[PDB]
Amino acid sequence: ELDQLRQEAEQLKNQIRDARKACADATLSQITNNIDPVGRIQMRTRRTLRGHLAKIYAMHWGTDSRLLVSASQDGKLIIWDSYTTNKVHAIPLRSSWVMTCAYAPSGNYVACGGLDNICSIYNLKTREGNVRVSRELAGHTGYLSCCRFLDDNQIVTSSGDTTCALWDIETGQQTTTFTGHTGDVMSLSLAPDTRLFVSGACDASAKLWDVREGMCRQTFTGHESDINAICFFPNGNAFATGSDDATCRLFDLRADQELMTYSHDNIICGITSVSFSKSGRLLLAGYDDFNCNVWDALKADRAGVLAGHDNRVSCLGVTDDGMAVATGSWDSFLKIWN
Amino acid sequence: MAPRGFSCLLLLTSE
Amino acid sequence: VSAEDKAAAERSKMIDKNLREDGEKAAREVKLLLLGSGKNTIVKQMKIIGIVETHFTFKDLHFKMFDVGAQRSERKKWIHCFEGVTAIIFCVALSAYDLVMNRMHASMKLFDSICNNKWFTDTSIILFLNKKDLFEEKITHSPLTICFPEYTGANKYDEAASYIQSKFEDLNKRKDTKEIYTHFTCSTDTKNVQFVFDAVTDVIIKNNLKDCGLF
Amino acid sequence: AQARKLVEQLKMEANIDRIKVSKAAADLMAYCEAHAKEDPLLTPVPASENPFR
Amino acid sequence: SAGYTVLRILPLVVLGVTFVLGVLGNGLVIWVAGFRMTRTVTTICYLNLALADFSFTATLPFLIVSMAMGEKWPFGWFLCKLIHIVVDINLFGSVFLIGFIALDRCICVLHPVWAQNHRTVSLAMKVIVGPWILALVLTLPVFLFLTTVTIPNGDTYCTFNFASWGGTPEERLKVAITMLTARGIIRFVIGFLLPMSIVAICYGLIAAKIHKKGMIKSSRPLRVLTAVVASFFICWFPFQLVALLGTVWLKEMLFYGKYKIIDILVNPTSSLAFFNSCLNPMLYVFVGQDFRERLIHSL
């Protein structure tokens, strides 16, 4: 019974692969060869943010492309005035083992999480006085690896317990739980409409979760190693995953196909952070070889290298308008590139 | 700590 | 204009001053990572003052002991977060050789997983052999041949404990770059804490001299 | 019941229709060329229009 | 006097190679530590030592072209005082920073708890400030007493002078002897006896502490420590001993000129001291694995 039912799933999985095989008739690079390549982009460090004394693990860009939050292991959560390199706030953390941080779309709340398994929500306004803890979301049995705000009241957080969960700030309880993964979830990304989001776990698979229904619409298994980064395309119909097998893969939701792979022969280190530009033409992906590489999202050609960091880069974010890209790294430095 | 070289030539008192 | 820009700069300077002070305050605590089986006994006997974080001060030295026992996830995903700890407090149950995949071999596998770890190449390990009182009453009844087939000595606590201690020390392939401080847990006061202080003190010498350049 | 739940989740993935990969690739490429002009990363902007000098 | 040509030529080439090596090493150390390295207590100590040595060696061409024709100064009053002020301040600062680094290493090794809980960057900068103040205080007599005087033969020799202070030649001679004796004693005690005793006492305690604990896993730390101590001794003790012998016999030298070996022996000893100043980064900064890793990464 149990073995026979499990065997049927394998046959059904083969049918999905067979359906994908029939769907796969022409690769993305096959039809993209008839357009002019972007070439080379000389991104330069416009400014350096130096206020962290420990490894920086995550950062998030503001919707106004002016304020960014940075999470570092020294127990400090700094709000950075990107234009003037100023420090808007320095949030103290009860637990210094923070591995993720989120910035609210409205700019009123900032989240953080990590080994404490608690998603702490911080009110940026605090008309009464200084910044203080607003709510602490403690319902996960695994390390919090990623978190992103849907709005001022809803937030979805990744966790090491293999299960993703969507939270509700006013009630402080899990609105829904996303189950179906196998490995530890490392990163999630939200579509521009905030109606559907992807998740990357340690089982070398990418899963698409519906926010309202709380169930897995789509599953993408194309990576040889675990996935550490994921990011939607600006159009919301595709996403790219960063793994530890030195390969970045682009998946599109409409066809459930591995559109293309972003790898080079001299790259053997893994990928910890990925992002897209305003138009999505440039796939900026962080790498474990102490520097970032800019990839052409249509031709797999490395159009630039961000090599202005002293340690391994762990986080990477692009502004909403695409004006600049900010790179985080374990060297306690934040580099902003145009 | 800078050693005087020719301060013994009676230039010490020369005006 | 400059009216609001100056105010933001002053706030950033005040924040930066707080960051330097908070960073300096956070820099004098000894960060220790717990792995392992007697881990709760070690924390309880020195609790002077997610992830279990405890802080205690001994001989004017502040310690930050972190327990990651309640983390049922992949170790390598978060084990790099502790890169830079002064030492690692590894707890091994002496009487777990008979208990069962052997429990003792699991501890050795976990011990080898951090000795060869790239994040702790220069990080010392403060090994503790816990529940030695139960081990001396168990070695006579249960020989070490069940756990270690390549054993030839008598089933006596005097040499069986040394053989077990030497087995873990020989498992570390990162020789000449770090030192493993081995101790046996005892119910007597201010001796497990003293060993932690003594081992950390020697590690501080190594860290200072490596920064100095002698080592 | 875990295996039964997995099948109930794996089955609906095949139910949803998949469009041609070439059509999805062409549509994805069309988005890049449509929004290429408002992409500062693609084409560098002068310091007057660049807040990061 | 057949062999005196070597005794005159060798100091010039020693000072030249000292200039080249000091400028190169100090520039590399400053560039790596101040921009490519984390701002730590050892980092700022090494950076201060490198800055002192660099400011000393950048002056070295002036001393070379001065002693090339016998200490003559083709330059002027302001530049002469600038050169000698820089030399004395940087030498005192370098020796005081060597002593302070020895003290810091002794504190870190003998008192690890105090180093962990009481060695902060701000306090470290505050206590680095002190040696510079001491150097300024000890260079004050170079500030006021030294000046430019011209011999009737048209050659310019800018050295210490008491034309204004004494008023009368007997008073000039008395105050000159007093100042030279005080300067020699101050140099021998504060500039030599204070750091040499500190270096010997401190570095002996690190060697004793590691020997007692049995932490010696290789001969590298012992070799580095003994090389530093031996270089500092064999490079400063000769010059300081020559200066002390000249100062104690200075009254006889001016009154009768009984001793003349000191006049020709100062130059090789000064060259050795300058070469110690230039090698200070090599034995103090280049011995760190992290520093060499950053240097090779930055190139």
Numbering used by the authors:
A (entry chain B): 3 to 340
B (entry chain L): 1 to 15
C (entry chain A): 5 to 40, 44 to 56, 184 to 234, 241 to 355
D (entry chain C): 10 to 62
E (entry chain R): 19 to 317
Wording from the paper:
In response to the N-formyl peptides from microbes and mitochondria, FPRs play crucial roles in host defense and inflammation. Although FPR1 and FPR2 share 69% sequence identity, these two receptors display distinct ligand-binding preferences. In contrast, FPR2 is promiscuous in ligand binding with recognition to a vast array of ligands with diverse sizes, structures and functions, ranging from small molecules and lipids to peptides and proteins, which enable its involvement in chronic inflammatory diseases such as AD, systemic amyloidosis, and atherosclerosis. In this work, we determined the cryo-electron microscopy (cryo-EM) structures of FPR2 bound to Gi and four peptide agonists with diverse sequences and lengths, including Aβ42, fHN, and two formyl peptides, N-formyl–MLFII (fM5, derivative of bacteria-derived formyl peptide) and N-formyl–MYFINILTL (fM9, mitochondria-derived formyl peptide).
Humanin (HN), a 24-amino acid polypeptide, was discovered to protect neuronal cells from apoptosis induced by Aβ, with proven effects on cell survival, metabolism, response to stressors, and inflammation. Further investigation identified FPR2 as a functional receptor of HN, providing a foundation for this peptide suppressing the effect of Aβ42 by competitively binding to FPR29. Similar to Aβ42 and the formyl peptides, fHN binds to the receptor through its N-terminal region, with unambiguous densities for residues fM1–E15 shown in the cryo-EM map. The C-terminal region of the peptide appears to be flexible and likely lacks contact with the receptor, and thus, was not modeled. Although having completely different amino-acid sequences, comparison of the fHN- and Aβ42-bound FPR2 structures reveals a similar binding pose for the backbones of the N-terminal segments in fHN (fM1–R4) and Aβ42 (D1–R5). Supported by our functional data, the formylated residue fM1 of fHN plays a crucial role in mediating both receptor activation and receptor–peptide recognition. Unlike Aβ42 that recognizes FPR2 by adopting a β-sheet structure, the majority of N-terminal part in fHN (residues R4–E15) exhibits a coiled conformation when bound to the receptor. Despite the distinct structures, these two peptides occupy a similar binding site in the extracellular region of the receptor, where the FPR2–fHN recognition is mainly mediated by two hydrophobic interaction cores. Side chains of R4, L10, and L12 in the peptide interact with a cluster of hydrophobic residues, F178, F180, A1945.31, L1985.35, and L272, in ECL2, ECL3, and the extracellular tip of helix V, while F6, L9, and L11 bind to a hydrophobic patch in ECL2 that includes V167, I169, and Y175.
